[PDB]
């Protein structure tokens, strides 16, 4: 299985077509790109019929299994596209795939797609099969160091002069959801055809664009002054956010916060962060919180969240926002006793 990057794919495709193509990674567009890059050469061969079946334990597998079991009377062929689960091929699916691993024939091109595979999942009978015929195309979101480079490269193919500083800002918001970044680019292509994206030009478009993730709220709450926090909240309403999703998002970060503070003298803040593995830059920020939130401030914040969560689901629609507001203010100043 020739392992290679999206970029070498077009080159490899040329030399010939291989039994099956494994698109593994989390990036929305590379997967897409690599995908269409494949089919573009298949229909270009004799593959008119194209199929796509998602892997979730609740699928209708007889349909699938028997659709490839059949050789065609008119040699018409097909392109089977399996959509791997979100979590990926569990134990029962290490076989379900091992089965379709010895059926392939030069007139049934296989293209599996999902997020990368774990060292374990990459030994599950099935993968080890394609292990000779196939090819895998690593599709992963570039890191913090190449993140901006990507935006620079790509931009350049969209015939764009995106300044470094204008590149940075963009890279700091939507820091990661490659999806949007790819978007805001073709959009900006549109604002200024034959224009330049100086820092003043992009920074405003982005500033005014004013989109806040409830993640933005939380992060503020991360000891950041309440001002922005509260604003991002009422803004986060006029973005028709559901309150249920705000609650549990802060939870993850508020609970995480309890442990960490709980583990002082357990292990230096350092070692700990890795351990939980959310520490992506948030480390400085998480730390900063863990310096002003008292063991008790935490709890209070946890009792409230609960009241909210509960009060949210027991009188279904008592305008929770009220409480959320108070809540945030709690995570920003010393507290009292009621």
């Amino acid at each position: 299985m020739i392992r290679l990057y999206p970029e070498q794919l077009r080159a490899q495709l040329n030399e010939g077509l291989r039994a099956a193509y494994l698109l593994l990674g989390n990036d929305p567009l590379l997967l897409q790109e690599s995908q269409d890059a494949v089919r573009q050469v298949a229909a270009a061969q004799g593959f008119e019929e194209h199929h796509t079946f998602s892997i979730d334990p609740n699928t209708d597998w007889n349909a699938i299994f028997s659709l490839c079991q059949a050789m065609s009377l008119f040699a018409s062929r097909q392109t089977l596209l399996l959509l791997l689960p979100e979590n990926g091929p569990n134990a029962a699916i290490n076989e379900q795939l091992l089965t379709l691993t010895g059926l392939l024939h030069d007139d049934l091109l296989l293209i599996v797609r999902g997020n990368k595979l774990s060292k374990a999942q990459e030994n599950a009978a099935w993968f080890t099969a394609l292990a000779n015929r196939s090819v895998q195309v690593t599709c992963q979101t570039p890191e913090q160091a190449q993140l901006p480079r990507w935006v620079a490269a790509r931009a350049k193919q969209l015939n764009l002069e995106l300044d470094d500083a204008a590149n940075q800002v963009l890279c700091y918001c939507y820091e990661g959801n490659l999806l949007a970044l790819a978007q805001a680019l073709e959009r900006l292509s549109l604002l200024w055809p034959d224009g330049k994206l100086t820092l003043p030009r992009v920074e405003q478009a982005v500033n005014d664009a004013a989109h806040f993730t409830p993640f933005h709220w939380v992060d503020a709450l991360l000891m950041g002054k309440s001002k922005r926090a509260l604003h991002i909240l009422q803004q986060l309403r006029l973005e028709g956010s559901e309150p249920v999703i705000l609650l549990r998002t802060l939870q993850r970060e508020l609970l995480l916060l309890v442990n960490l503070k709980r583990q002082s003298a357990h292990t230096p803040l350092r070692a700990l962060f890795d351990k939980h593995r959310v520490w992506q830059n948030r480390r400085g920020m998480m730390g900063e919180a863990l310096n002003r939130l008292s063991q008790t401030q935490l709890r209070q914040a946890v009792q409230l969240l609960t009241r909210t969560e509960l009060t949210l689901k027991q009188d279904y629609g008592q305008s929770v926002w009220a409480e959320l507001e108070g809540l945030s203010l709690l995570l920003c100043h010393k507290p009292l006793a009621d």
């Binding site: 073709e186 549109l190 664009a209 009422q234 973005e239 028709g240 203010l329 100043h333």
Partner: protein, 364 residues
């Protein structure tokens, strides 16, 4: 309803969506036309209005323009919704579930009248697993002369693949001042009466949903019978702020029975959700109690209040304040078990008054 009567006919007619207008306008001025658009945002922000304008500058007999002339038969029948080349589909309706499944399995590649065969699917996230893959197979192979204008209030319930082949445009809600200033106009050109207060009681009410604001403004004339006075506006939209909810707190610390009672009478006069009055009160007490710990404890709209609140913060011992929080708190908890709601409140303040820190009442 003023809702339909004032629907935008031109890009100059759209309230605060600049970053979306400038974009669409320009991509229309330089003949740059993608194969599919997607407008996302909340209720009555103008997703539909901009999609329709968009379809209109594309099929303007005057030519592909950022400024449809608005008088062509292409512009008129599109305005009417009776445009052969403007197939509108609702993925939200229960009744048209079949005409929504078929209009896509049978896309029409050749335009009947204008230059384009535009489609517009409201709440496009509401399609059937079937209709999805259908619109996917179509945008994967964008049939020319066939454009796709999508709208959704939740571009997240959409598969990435489809969102992948579109050009999204996030519309923001509208400012409370961006609306009040949009009414003051819509009104003054329809020669109707109004008070600056009323206009703000309305804008606010509409939660960034202009559509609603107007749909509300019609009723306020329906009930106010012609005039848009605060009185009629607040009639349906209760006294949404009344700095008395606080005036009661103070009236309470000052231990000015006469005012407390008086003030309640004024609230009762209007008729308020009693216990609401309690929580409100409490919660003030609760911030004032906060404020006096970390002064930077006054959020966004605390501004009008600001001075009033601070004064209390300082001038009143953190203890006495807990006493109130508590007393007040407790009175709510018993409220439904009071001979009568208002009484319950009066009677609970009376509590504080005799159980007051300084100033408590006497006996002979």
């Amino acid at each position: 309803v003023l809702a339909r009567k004032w629907r935008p006919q031109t890009f100059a007619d759209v309230v605060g969506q600049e970053h979306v207008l400038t974009a669409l306008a320009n991509g229309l001025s330089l003949g740059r036309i993608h194969h599919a658009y997607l407008f996302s945002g909340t209720r009555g922000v103008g997703k539909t209005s901009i999609a329709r304008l968009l379809a209109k500058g594309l099929n303007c007999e005057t030519g592909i323009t950022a400024t449809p002339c608005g008088v062509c038969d292409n512009c008129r029948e599109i305005e009417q919704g009776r445009f052969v080349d403007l197939i509108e589909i609702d993925a939200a309706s229960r009744t048209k579930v079949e005409d929504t499944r078929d209009l896509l399995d049978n896309v029409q590649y050749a335009p009947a009248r204008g230059r384009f065969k535009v489609y517009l699917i409201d709440e496009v996230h509401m399609l059937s697993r079937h209709s999805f893959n259908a619109l996917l197979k179509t945008l994967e192979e964008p049939p020319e002369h066939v454009k796709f204008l999508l709208a959704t209030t939740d571009p997240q319930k959409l598969p990435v693949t489809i969102l992948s082949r579109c050009l999204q445009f996030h519309l923001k809600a509208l400012d409370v001042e961006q609306i009040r200033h949009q009414l003051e106009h819509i009104l003054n050109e329809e020669h109707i009466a109004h008070e600056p207060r009323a206009l703000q009681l309305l804008a606010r009410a509409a939660e960034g949903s202009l559509r609603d604001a107007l749909s509300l403004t019609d009723q306020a004339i329906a009930s106010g019978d012609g005039q848009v006075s605060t009185q009629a506006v607040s009639a349906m939209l209760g006294t949404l702020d009344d700095d008395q909810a606080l005036s009661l707190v103070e009236a309470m610390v000052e231990a000015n029975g006469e005012r407390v009672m008086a003030l309640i009478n004024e609230a009762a006069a209007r008729g308020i959700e009693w216990e609401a009055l309690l929580v409100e009160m409490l919660g003030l007490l609760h911030r004032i109690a906060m404020v006096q710990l970390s002064p930077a404890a006054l959020g966004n709209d605390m501004a009008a209040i600001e001075l009033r609140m601070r004064e209390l913060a300082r001038t009143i011992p953190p203890t006495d304040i807990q006493l109130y929080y508590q007393t007040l708190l407790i009175g709510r908890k018993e409220l439904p078990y009071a001979p009568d709601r208002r009484m319950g409140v009066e009677m609970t303040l009376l509590r504080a008054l005799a159980f007051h820190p300084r100033m408590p009442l006497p006996e002979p």
